[PDB]
Amino acid sequence: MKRTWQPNRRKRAKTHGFRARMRTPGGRKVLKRRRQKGRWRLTPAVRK
Amino acid sequence: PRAKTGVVRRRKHKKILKLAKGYWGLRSKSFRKARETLFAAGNYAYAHRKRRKRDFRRLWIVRINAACRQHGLNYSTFIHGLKKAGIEVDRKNLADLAVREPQVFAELVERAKAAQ
Amino acid sequence: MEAKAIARYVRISPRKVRLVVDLIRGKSLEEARNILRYTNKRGAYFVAKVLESAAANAVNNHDMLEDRLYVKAAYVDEGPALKRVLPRARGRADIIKKRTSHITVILGEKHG
Amino acid sequence: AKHPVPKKKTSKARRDARRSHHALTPPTLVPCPECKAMKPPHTVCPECGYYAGRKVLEV
């Protein structure tokens, strides 16, 4: 049946994207947190 | 300092397993099953160390009885006679006499019969 | 004098090859050869090679005569298992063990 | 059903007892009267190709 992951590039970037994270106090904390952890990707990989 | 298990436990398990040599299946191969077996074994030894003294006395009595009825009396009568005669050779030797030295055993039967 | 061959890491399961090996233990090199040729098993292929190479070893390295060689000892040992995932129903995953054999054939000479 | 299951692990003795019938029977072979090679009976000899006295097959 129709499962839950229904990939969409625009949807993806607009929701978890770097600019999306920056617009918001929480998302900037997300970016802060992931950078302090040493994550190689602060943001979900995406292609355009 | 940190004191890890290290060498100690393996050595204790080896101790037990070596004692469990000869045992069936995991009883000789697995520490846990071995240990359980060995407890049983230990109590059996103790208990049987005891019954060995019983197991033999019963045998001697059966043997002495047989040799008595050859001379026309039973064990009970025989022993009473010996008691009356003051003969204190025990049943270990009484039996050995009853088999190896039947003449001497015969004489003891005489003494027993006379003491009644 | 003896000659040995070993095939390490054969991608078959020991319990299976051993069946084939059991057929040829103690046989003359000539009978063993015939046996293996008409044994209907995958294992027969692997065993034959180890046997054939050991025969080679005896002739070529150990001054033993082909017409006297016999399977003195033979045995299969378990090698490291290749673990694979087998997807089952209801989201469960099993683990297949694709197993491994170390096959040994040892030849001696039947004298006289 | 209610999903039956082994109640106890089978012992080394008992699993091997089960396998007391598992040994392979060696292939039954006879000499080919033409080339004396060993082959299963009632099959065309895969070495010289002869059966019933004549050449039948290109080996």
Add this chain to the structure above:
Amino acid sequence: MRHLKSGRKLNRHSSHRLALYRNQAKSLLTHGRITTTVPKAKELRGFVDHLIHLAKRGDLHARRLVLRDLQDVKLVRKLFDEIAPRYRDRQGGYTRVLKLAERRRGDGAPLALVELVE
């Protein structure tokens, strides 16, 4: 049970089984000798023998009969003109089956050859 029943099933339904013998017949009659598994081999004999017997008759009818299974006019011409005469005097047994000595690697199937006779 199976008491006194004649005919292998060869793990095929009715139409596949029929097709199987026909294609075998086309190949036997074509190449003179094919290799199959022993069971198909033994079962192929009579199916082909009958077809050869009809060729031994020669009439238009028997030709149209064989065509129902063999389906190829050229193959049948070969059957009637070259094959059938070889058997003018032979009373049945137009085919033989001899078993090979080695099995298939991939599934262990025992093999046999089936050929037209001299």
Add this chain to the structure above:
RNA sequence: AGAUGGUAAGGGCCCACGGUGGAUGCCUCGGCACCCGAGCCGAUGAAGGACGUGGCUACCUGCGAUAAGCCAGGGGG
């Protein structure tokens, strides 16, 4: 009429020797704690990255189309 042995398809205990596995001991390019030292960076565009960069170059490191490096001072041999 009497009695007593060799059977092992396979199993069991023991001994040897292997396979598998990776405990134990030893080892440490790593960590931990205290102590001391030291302590901001950024529109002269930071932190952190992306993509590039080698004669042959996957990754890491270095570096930035002057790209495992350019100039000068000092050290060193």
Add this chain to the structure above:
RNA sequence: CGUGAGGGAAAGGUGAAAAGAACCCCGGGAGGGGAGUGAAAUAGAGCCUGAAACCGUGGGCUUACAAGCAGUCACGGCCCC
């Protein structure tokens, strides 16, 4: 692994020195057997030591009229010292 925030592993050791096994042999290869190296190669790279469960090969004793938490006590047979 999770859409995401986020979760989050496993994985060290040849040898003093690569001297990391030329060459020959079986094999499609993997693998092995000689030759060679090394104080050592069951230190051969799937590499220090290499326990245990677990699997196998060989040998000794034993088992197909017998009742079991598998032991223990006694005696006897066989094998070894």
Add this chain to the structure above:
RNA sequence: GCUGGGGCUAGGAGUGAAAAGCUAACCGAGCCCGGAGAUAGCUGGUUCUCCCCGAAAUGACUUUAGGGUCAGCCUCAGGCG
């Protein structure tokens, strides 16, 4: 009426032709990280050896009754005799 694409509304909040349905495969209150090692009068588990002594399952009170406080009963040290 159904369906693609682009959007908006969410955790005591959304959305609901209403079933406490659904809100990323368990929703009478999502998920992650944090408070956090919550609390658990409950269940389980608690690892070498020898030697000496050796209980209780009663009384009183208790939002107490399978938990407690004191007393009874065990043990050790010193004192008395």
Add this chain to the structure above:
RNA sequence: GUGGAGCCUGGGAGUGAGGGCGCGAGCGAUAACGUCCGCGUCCGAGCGCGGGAACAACCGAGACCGCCAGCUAAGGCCCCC
């Protein structure tokens, strides 16, 4: 009456679901392997030993270790024994 008696001061407890049996009652039906008190006992913790076919608490008896020695207890002495 010198006892792992007793008393005094302290340190550490554990126990505060008992149970069978005998005797005396209540409750029950002069029912229950029932319930609830009293005196005692044993099991608990002596599922260690002997007897009772077998069986925590019935009878016998309180197992420091060893003995191929003797006497008894309850219970037994026709065979299993």
Add this chain to the structure above:
RNA sequence: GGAUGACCCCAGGCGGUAGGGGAGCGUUCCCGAUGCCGAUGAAGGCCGACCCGCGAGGGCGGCUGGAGGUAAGGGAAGUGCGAAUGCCGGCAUGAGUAACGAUAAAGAGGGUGAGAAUCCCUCUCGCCGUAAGCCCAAGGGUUCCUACGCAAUGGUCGUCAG
């Protein structure tokens, strides 16, 4: 008794759960250590029917191992495992068993190759045909086309292959 813990003699106690008390064993580490044991072989491992200890253990011997270990007497703790549907890993049992993923379907000949039911070619047969064919968009990201391969991936095989 002798001098006070030397050892001897005589006597009595010595079942034990919760629990109290006493005495010891062993593990990591520190002083003892600028020492001593050690390649004439450290630790660790494997045997032992030998010795000491009531016991926990300690020796000694042989084999392994190849570079460490540390006494008498003291000091300090991450100090002893069989159970926690414990944790991590390894390996068993079930078992050569169930299964190998639509019942549209196969057969032969000829190639190739160490090896072929499974790769290529041919012929025969069967299945889809508002599809099981064709073309877009999402999404996936080199999977495309050749050459050379078959350890692993492929539910078998493999010379073939996303």
